[PDB]
Amino acid sequence: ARTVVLITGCSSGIGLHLAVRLASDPSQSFKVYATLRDLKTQGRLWEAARALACPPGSLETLQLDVRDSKSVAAARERVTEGRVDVLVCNAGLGLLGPLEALGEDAVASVLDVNVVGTVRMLQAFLPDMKRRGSGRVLVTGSVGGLMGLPFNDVYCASKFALEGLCESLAVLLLPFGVHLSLIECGPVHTAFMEKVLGSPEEVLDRTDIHTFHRFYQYLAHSKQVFREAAQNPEEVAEVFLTALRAPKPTLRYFTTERFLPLLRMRLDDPSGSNYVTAMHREVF
Amino acid sequence: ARTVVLITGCSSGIGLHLAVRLASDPSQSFKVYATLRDLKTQGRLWEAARALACPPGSLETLQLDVRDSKSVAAARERVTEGRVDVLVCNAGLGLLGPLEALGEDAVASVLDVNVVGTVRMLQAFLPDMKRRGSGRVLVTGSVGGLMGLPFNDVYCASKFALEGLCESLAVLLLPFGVHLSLIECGPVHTAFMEKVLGSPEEVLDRTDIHTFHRFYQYLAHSKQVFREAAQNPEEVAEVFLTALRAPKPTLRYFTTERFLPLLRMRLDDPSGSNYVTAMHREVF
Numbered sequence: 001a002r003t004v005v006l007i008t009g010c011s012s013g014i015g016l017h018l019a020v021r022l023a024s025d026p027s028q029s030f031k032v033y034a035t036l037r038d039l040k041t042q043g044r045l046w047e048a049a050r051a052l053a054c055p056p057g058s059l060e061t062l063q064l065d066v067r068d069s070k071s072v073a074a075a076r077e078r079v080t081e082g083r084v085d086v087l088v089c090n091a092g093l094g095l096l097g098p099l100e101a102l103g104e105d106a107v108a109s110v111l112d113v114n115v116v117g118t119v120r121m122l123q124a125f126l127p128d129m130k131r132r133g134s135g136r137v138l139v140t141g142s143v144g145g146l147m148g149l150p151f152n153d154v155y156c157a158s159k160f161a162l163e164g165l166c167e168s169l170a171v172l173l174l175p176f177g178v179h180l181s182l183i184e185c186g187p188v189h190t191a192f193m194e195k196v197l198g199s200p201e202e203v204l205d206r207t208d209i210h211t212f213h214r215f216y217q218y219l220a221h222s223k224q225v226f227r228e229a230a231q232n233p234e235e236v237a238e239v240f241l242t243a244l245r246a247p248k249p250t251l252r253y254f255t256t257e258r259f260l261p262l263l264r265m266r267l268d269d270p271s272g273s274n275y276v277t278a279m280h281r282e283v284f
Numbered sequence: 285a286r287t288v289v290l291i292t293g294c295s296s297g298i299g300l301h302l303a304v305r306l307a308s309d310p311s312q313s314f315k316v317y318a319t320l321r322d323l324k325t326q327g328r329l330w331e332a333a334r335a336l337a338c339p340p341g342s343l344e345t346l347q348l349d350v351r352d353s354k355s356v357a358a359a360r361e362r363v364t365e366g367r368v369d370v371l372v373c374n375a376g377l378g379l380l381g382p383l384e385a386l387g388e389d390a391v392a393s394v395l396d397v398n399v400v401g402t403v404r405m406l407q408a409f410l411p412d413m414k415r416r417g418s419g420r421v422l423v424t425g426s427v428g429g430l431m432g433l434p435f436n437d438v439y440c441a442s443k444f445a446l447e448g449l450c451e452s453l454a455v456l457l458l459p460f461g462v463h464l465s466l467i468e469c470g471p472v473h474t475a476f477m478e479k480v481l482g483s484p485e486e487v488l489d490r491t492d493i494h495t496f497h498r499f500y501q502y503l504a505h506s507k508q509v510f511r512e513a514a515q516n517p518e519e520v521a522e523v524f525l526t527a528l529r530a531p532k533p534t535l536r537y538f539t540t541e542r543f544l545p546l547l548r549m550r551l552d553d554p555s556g557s558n559y560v561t562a563m564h565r566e567v568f
C-alpha cells in the first residue's frame with residue numbers, strides 16, 4: 001500500500017536527512033531503502049533514525065556502490081515490494097582545487113560517481129517505470145550545475161553534466177507519466193567543505209604561487225558565502241517532499257532563490273563575458 | 285616567429301578542416317601540430333592538405349589518444365618550439381540512443397574522451413601558459429552543451445560538462461592573460477550521423493516498443509534539422525580563426541544564431557517546464 005522510495009548516498013547530509021524525514025513521517029506512507037557506499041558508515045543513519053523515532057520497518061539499509069552496475073543490480077533485486085515509486089539519485093563526490101593540482105584518478109572518480117553512477121541508476125530503474133507508466137525520479141542538483149565557479153572546475157563539470165542528462169531525459173519521459181526533477185541546492189550545512197581539498201603543502205607543490213594565492217582568496221570568500229547562505233538539510237529535504245507530492249512536477253526545484261539573479265545575468269549574455277567578469281569581481 | 289597551434293582530433297570534420305585552413309593560410313603565420321587518435325586514419329588529412337596546397341613544414345601529424353595522459357605528455361614533448369600559443373581541444377565522441385540501450389562502456393568512453401580528455405589536455409598545457417602569461421585555448425562546443433535533446437542524454441551530459449569546466453576555468457584565468465573560448469557549433473556537415481547509433485535490431489532488443497518508436501521519430505526530425513541547418517566545416521573553422529584573432533576573446537562564440545531563441549526560452553523559465561514542453565512539441 002506504501003510509496004516505495006530508494007535513495008542513494010544516505011550515510012550523511014541530504015540523503016541521510018531525507019531518508020529519515022520520509023521514514024519518520026507522521027503519516028507512515030513511505031517505505032524507505034536507504035543505500036550507502038559503505039555499511040561501516042551507517043551508524044549516524046541509525047543515531048538519527050532513533051532521534052526522529054522512525055517506526056520499525058520504515059527504514060531498510062542496503063549497500064550500493066554506484067560505480068558498480070552489479071551492486072546497482074543487487075540493490076534492485078533486494079526491493080521485495082518489486083517496484084520503486086520514487087528513485088532519489090543523491091550519491092555524489094566533491095572535488096576542489098587548482099585543476100592542474102587534481103589527480104587524474106580523482107577526476108575520473110568524480111565523473112564516474114556523479115554522472116555515470118546516475119546513468120547506471122536510471123538504466124536499472126527507468127525501464128520498469130516506463131512499463132508501469134508511473135514513477136518519480138528526484139536528482140540532487142547544485143547551483144554549481146547552473147554556473148561555473150573557480151576551483152570547482154571538475155565538480156561543476158559533473159553537475160552541469162547532470163543538467164544535460166536529466167533535461168534530455170525529461171523531453172522524452174513527458175508522455176510516459178514518469179516524472180524527473182532536479183533539486184537545485186545552494187550551499188548546505190553538512191560536512192563537505194574541507195574533506196575534498198588537499199593539504200596546503202600538497203597544493204602548492206602542484207601549482208604556481210599566484211594560483212595558490214587565488215585559491216586562498218576563493219576559500220576565504222567561499223567561507224563567507226556559506227556563513228551567510230548555507231541552508232540546513234532539513235530545509236533541503238522538504239523541497240524533495242514538495243517535488244514528490246506535486247501532481248505535475250517541473251524539471252527543476254530551487255531550494256533558494258538567492259542565486260537566481262546571478263543565473264539571469266549568465267543567461268542573458270550568452271558570450272559569457274558578463275558572467276565571467278561579475279564572478280571574477282565577486283570571488284576576488 | 286610563428287604561432288604554434290596544437291589541435292586534437294584531426295582525422296576528420298572540424299579538426300581536419302581547421303588544421304589545414306591554418307597550415308595553408310596565405311600569410312604562413314601558423315605552425316600546426318595536427319593530432320589524431322590513430323595514425324592509420326591520417327590519409328584524408330594529407331589528401332586535403334595537398335588540395336589546399338599546404339606548404340612543406342606547415343603541418344606536422346602526431347599520435348595523441350586523449351584517454352591516455354602518457355600519450356598527452358609524449359605529444360607535448362614532441363613540440364620542438366617548446367611552447368604552444370594556441371591549444372585547440374576538439375577530439376570528441378558521439379553517442380545516440382535510448383539511455384537503457386547504451387552500453388556502460390560506451391557511456392564511460394564518451395565521458396572519458398569528451399570531458400576527462402579535455403581536462404588532461406588542460407592539465408598538461410595550461411601550466412606553461414600561466415607562467416608565460418600568454419596563450420589561447422579553443423574548445424569545440426555544441427548547442428547540445430546548452431540545451432538537452434532526447435536520445436542524446438550522454439552526449440549532452442558530456443557537452444554540458446565542458447561548459448561547466450571551461451566557465452569555471454575562465455573565471456580564474458581572466459587576470460593571467462590566458463584566454464579560453466568555447467566555439468558553440470550547431471549541426472555541421474561531416475560524417476557523425478549514423479556511425480554512433482546501433483542497428484535497429486540491437487536497439488529494439490534493448491528498449492520498449494514505444495521508446496523505439498519515439499527514437500525513429502526523433503531521427504526523422506533530426507534529419508530534417510540537419511537538412512535545413514547544417515553548416516560546413518569551412519564556415520565552422522573560420523569562427524575558430526575569429527576567436528584566435530580577437531584581442532579580447534569572449535568565453536563563447538556561436539557558429540550560428542539559429543538556436544539562440546530556443547536558448548532564451550530555456551534561460552527565462554528556470555523551472556525547465558517551457559523548454560521541455562517546447563522541445564517535446566518540436567521533436568515529436
Ligand SMILES: NC(=O)c1ccc[n+]([C@@H]2O[C@H](COP(=O)([O-])OP(=O)(O)OC[C@H]3O[C@@H](n4cnc5c(N)ncnc54)[C@H](OP(=O)(O)O)[C@@H]3O)[C@@H](O)[C@H]2O)c1
Nearest residue numbers: 009010011012013014015036037065066091092140185188
Ligand atoms: N553539501 C552541500 O553543501 C550541498 C550543496 C548543494 C547540493 N548538494 C548535493 O547533494 C548531494 C549530496 O550532498 P550532501 O552531503 O548534502 O548529502 P549526501 O546524502 O551525503 O550525499 C553525498 C553522499 O554520496 C555518497 N557516496 C559517495 N560515494 C558513493 C558511491 N560510490 N556510491 C554511492 N554513494 C556514494 C555518500 O554516502 P554513502 O555511503 O551513502 O554512499 C554520501 O552520503 C550531491 O549530489 C550534491 O550536489 C550538497
Ligand SMILES: NC(=O)c1ccc[n+]([C@@H]2O[C@H](COP(=O)([O-])OP(=O)(O)OC[C@H]3O[C@@H](n4cnc5c(N)ncnc54)[C@H](OP(=O)(O)O)[C@@H]3O)[C@@H](O)[C@H]2O)c1
Nearest residue numbers: 293294295296297298299320321349350375376424469472
Ligand atoms: N559533427 C557535427 O555535426 C558537430 C556539430 C557541432 C559540434 N561539433 C563538435 O566538434 C568536435 C568534433 O566534431 P567533427 O566531426 O566536426 O570534428 P573532428 O575533428 O572529427 O572531431 C571528432 C574527432 O575526435 C577524434 N577522437 C576520437 N577519439 C579520440 C581520442 N581517444 N583521442 C583523441 N581524439 C579522438 C577523432 O580523430 P582523431 O583520430 O584525430 O583523434 C575525430 O576526428 C566535437 O567536440 C563536437 O562537439 C561537431
Ligand SMILES: C[C@]12CC[C@@H]3c4ccc(O)cc4CC[C@H]3[C@@H]1C[C@H](Cc1cccc(C(N)=O)c1)[C@@H]2O
Nearest residue numbers: 094095096142143144152155186187192196222282
Ligand atoms: C556552487 C555552490 C553555490 C554557489 C556558491 C557561491 C556563490 C557565489 C560566490 O560568489 C561564491 C560561491 C562559492 C560557494 C558556492 C557553492 C558551492 C556549493 C557546491 C559544493 C559544495 C561542497 C563541495 C564542492 C566541491 N567539492 O567542489 C562544491 C554550491 O553548490
Ligand SMILES: C[C@]12CC[C@@H]3c4ccc(O)cc4CC[C@H]3[C@@H]1C[C@H](Cc1cccc(C(N)=O)c1)[C@@H]2O
Nearest residue numbers: 378379380426427428436439470471476480506566
Ligand atoms: C545538438 C545539435 C544542435 C541542435 C539540433 C536540434 C535542434 C532542434 C531540434 O528540434 C532538434 C535538433 C536535433 C539535432 C540537434 C543537433 C545535434 C548536434 C550534435 C550531435 C552531432 C552528432 C552526433 C551527436 C550524438 N552522438 O549525440 C550529436 C548539434 O549539436
